[PDB]
Amino acid sequence: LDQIWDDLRAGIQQVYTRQSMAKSRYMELYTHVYNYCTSVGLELYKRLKEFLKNYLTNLLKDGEDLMDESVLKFYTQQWEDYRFSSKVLNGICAYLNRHWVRRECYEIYSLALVTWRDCLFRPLNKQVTNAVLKLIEKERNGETINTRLISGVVQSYVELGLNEDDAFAKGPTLTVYKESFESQFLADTERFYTRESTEFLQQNPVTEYMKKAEARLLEEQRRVQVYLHESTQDELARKCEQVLIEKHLEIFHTEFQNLLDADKNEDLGRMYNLVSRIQDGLGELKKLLETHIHNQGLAAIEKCGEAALNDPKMYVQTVLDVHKKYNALVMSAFNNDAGFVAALDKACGRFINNNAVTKMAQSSSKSPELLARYCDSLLKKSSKNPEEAELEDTLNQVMVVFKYIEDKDVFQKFYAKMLAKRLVHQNSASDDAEASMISKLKQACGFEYTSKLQRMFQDIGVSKDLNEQFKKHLTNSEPLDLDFSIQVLSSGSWPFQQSCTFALPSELERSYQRFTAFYASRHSGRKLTWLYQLSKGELVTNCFKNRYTLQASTFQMAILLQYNTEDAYTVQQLTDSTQIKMDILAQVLQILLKSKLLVLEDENANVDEVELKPDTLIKLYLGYKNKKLRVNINVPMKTEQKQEQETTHKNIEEDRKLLIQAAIVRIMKMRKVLKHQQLLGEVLTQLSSRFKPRVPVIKKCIDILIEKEYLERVDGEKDTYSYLA
């Protein structure tokens, strides 16, 4: 009764600001209560709550309305000494908490806290927090701050999370924290930087802004691991982010660009990581770098120009420069972010298939050509040789450019007409070079792509074999007068073209008939068509006051062996004896003249410009003299290379048509009845991997496919066709 409560309070009034009271006191207090609940004793709690609800009201009286860094030095220590005591008090009321509170079917310490948010539901919710912010505002400087002053404050509101009846609290209590602080924290923190952002924004640098707004973000993260609670950090961060990065994006985009125009590159990394944060942040930088490098490329080649147009190393190289340049940027400053790798790739693709170069040449397809021509210049017998890895490496580079080639049919087709010649003439740099190229290309475009490159190869080993068969057949009952050697290529597997009606000069009759005989001993019917436009042979002179070994084309040898008799023939004369078409003689005579084995009547004639007329004499120049014994005058027409490129390109145009038809039919079969647009669309979907047909070309194929009755229009329907078998 009123007895134990008078002395119980006597102690409870002491358990606070405890003078290290002897355990004798607690023991009394404990059983003081043990009995008070046995004499329900419900009243006791009623007394306790009252005692608490009072002491604090009185506590508030002190420090009453004294916001600040006042409540600081205060609300901390106060909550502190209160806590412990309330803790000790629960330990005391223990018996109470037991048999009273399970009877429900309301602890004291809890009561202690609830009783405290009635010190909160007053000054300490409102001005104290607004003190904390005052201290926190020392984000700028100062020190020092004494985190301890805020930690207690914080851990308080956290703890006072609430406890008026849920039982215990499933997730974190943390309703008071946010609503009494977190909310009031963030809002006040934003303005800080929102003022400093715009402050800086105008007074300092787009570089020395990120550098800072970078660090502060870090700080804000720091000041949460020590004046926290756990997620006020991302929410805190999510906030400082919006304030530093992303309402400043346009204030960053214009800067990002300049950071490109100047290779100022760690400025881009921070530019990135910052925007990396904001969701959908890169979306634009990814378009700026995308469109940016595109320029660089479209420019760096633009400089080269009329040169690049005919200089593969330069063209391909200038390209592999812009690429390998900006690639390392994405790998570096942009953390090889696939999104930014796309930018690069999309741009590279854009300017590799279209640029000052292709424009001049008037066609996207030059690019693959120049990439073809490059490789050949690379797989061709080099003046010396190239270092293994070196080649293999550049060859792996050519493939980076290839990776963006739109007309890969064009590349392939060239790389083919080129391998042809290289194979045909044992003129390859390293054999393992080709072998690697073919592989390097097989990977992307499968065996099918490289099949023909391999057919040619394997078909060449054969010829080598058969040649021996003949070289052997010689040291047999059959001796040949001159060093003979032949390449017997499968009319089907090579890209050659028989020839220009030759007359086979006598000195070659023997070797022709013999091997022609020797080949009879193989394929009963097999036809040999002798590619004279492509055959070697050497000449050895006795007429010039020096011994030259002319390395010459068969046509040159033909016209040259002609001088073994009457000395100076007009053009008509050679085009009758050699039986080699004027159109072709002239260009060859052009060459023979340019090397002065031949010299025309007029010693001033600029052979390299003069026009050959049937009647124009072609004197053998006997005074001839070369700075070399063994001269290789077999560089045919200069123009040939042009007609090759030309005729070889047109050889493709007609080849895309068939592949296109062969798609239409393919599609029209699978579909049976289809609308124009969809038909067209499909065609692309198909052919993209090799080349993007131009609608008007397909449109053409469609008709051809109708004429050839493979598919017809559906009478009484706008743009529709039916697969008619």
Binding site: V424, S490, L508, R526, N542, T565
Partner: protein
């Protein structure tokens, strides 16, 4: 005086099959712009397209003379085994 003597000579030759030129084979009438179908049905795009289609067996016929066989049989109208194409 004026003397050149052939010391070396590297020739190059294609090797076909020789069920002769005589014509095409699967329409037979020389590997000309004929192939039969185009000749009569001339002045049509389908004619201005007539080329040789090289086998793999090395028999080759006009493109058409074969396109138009395949819609039916795939084997090679001269070497039993199937077609393959290559070169135009």
């Amino acid at each position: 005086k004026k003397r050149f003597e052939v010391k070396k000579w590297n020739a190059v030759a294609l090797w076909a099959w020789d069920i002769v030129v005589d014509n095409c084979a699967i329409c037979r009438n020389h590997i000309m712009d004929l192939c039969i179908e185009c000749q009569a049905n001339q002045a049509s795009a389908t004619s201005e397209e007539c080329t040789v289609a090289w086998g793999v067996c090395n028999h080759a016929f006009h493109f058409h003379c074969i396109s138009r066989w395949l819609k039916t049989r795939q084997v090679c109208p001269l070497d039993n085994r199937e077609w393959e194409f290559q070169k135009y």
